[PDB]
Design a protein around this ligand. Structure first.
Ligand SMILES: NC(=O)c1ccc[n+]([C@@H]2O[C@H](COP(=O)([O-])OP(=O)(O)OC[C@H]3O[C@@H](n4cnc5c(N)ncnc54)[C@H](O)[C@@H]3O)[C@@H](O)[C@H]2O)c1
Ligand SMILES: [Mg+2]
Ligand code: NA
Length: 251
């Protein structure tokens, strides 16, 4: 649909501009430096899977935006997979309800959407040009958040973490060595990474003016009144940034 095609394109463009503002680099630039990898307009076959293919249609527009030679197969599932390989797909892109993967058939590399999304959003946060300290707050330590937190620890940031699930908070503290954040004793941050399927997860007392909030979480961690009040630099996009991360990770 022509209306929806203008919509994702604009949404990706707006997300690109926001990343440029924060880091001085576009999404492509972030990916290339993150993975040390470059694209040659690889052929990517998107196969719809039963688990109406509007998702695969979004993926086509997203991959076209990033310059990939992408196509959606006529058939779904196993028949679609067969079709994709036969039509010379170098990378396979497909998702069920629990896993969204990219598989590079040439080099054997395979990416999972969840760690790839966490890593890139953490990466964008870590590359904030106007950051005044090495302190970073991570809210949400699940499938997306944990790999994000791990990436930040490896990049030598002082990582503060919180998750409403005490078991996951404890396990993140043990394995990663992050400082457990106490909502009862809050401090201000200039860099925040949220990976949570909930709203209003970032307390006001944690925000400083012009701080970066890098969040793949849906819905938004912050109310639009709070982001206006603190002039929050929001990095938030529903699918494209995570997808770019997957593709560049397997090149
Ligand atoms: N934008 C994208 O491209 C993209 C890609 C993948 C996933 N996502 C989204 O990212 C979000 C996280 O995904 P996930 O797979 O990590 O989910 P998950 O369930 O594995 O992890 C979410 C974690 O957040 C915690 N949490 C919930 N409410 C909280 C609160 N108020 N304070 C602190 N912690 C809280 C939960 O305990 C949970 O451990 C989801 O909304 C998902 O839809 C977005
Ligand atoms: Mg995204
Ligand atoms: Na959220």
């Amino acid at each position: 649909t022509p209306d929806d095609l203008i919509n994702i394109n604009m949404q990706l463009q707006k997300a690109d501009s926001a990343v440029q503002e924060v880091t001085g680099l576009d999404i492509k630039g972030i990916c290339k430096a993150l993975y040390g990898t470059f694209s040659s307009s690889e052929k990517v076959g998107i196969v719809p899977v039963t688990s109406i293919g509007n998702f695969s249609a979004s993926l086509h527009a997203i991959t076209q935006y990033f310059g990939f030679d992408s196509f959606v197969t006529d058939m779904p599932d196993v028949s679609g997979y067969y079709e994709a390989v036969q039509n010379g797909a170098e990378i396979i892109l497909m998702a069920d309800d629990r896993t969204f993967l990219a598989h590079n058939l040439k080099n054997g590399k395979m990416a999972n959407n969840q760690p790839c999304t966490g890593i890139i959003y953490a990466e964008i946060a870590s590359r904030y040009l106007k950051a005044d300290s090495k302190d970073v707050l991570v809210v949400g330590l699940g499938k997306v958040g944990f790999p994000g937190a791990e990436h930040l620890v490896q990049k030598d940031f002082r990582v503060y973490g919180y998750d409403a699930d005490e078991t996951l908070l404890e396990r993140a503290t043990s394995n990663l060595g992050i400082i457990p954040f106490d909502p009862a004793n809050p401090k201000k941050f200039s860099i925040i990474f949220e990976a949570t399927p909930c709203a209003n997860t970032i307390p006001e007392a944690v925000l400083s003016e012009n701080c970066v909030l890098s969040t793949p979480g849906i819905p938004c961690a912050i109310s639009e009144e709070l982001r206006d009040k603190y002039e929050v630099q929001l990095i938030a996009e529903p699918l494209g940034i995570g997808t770019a991360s997957m593709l560049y990770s397997v090149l």
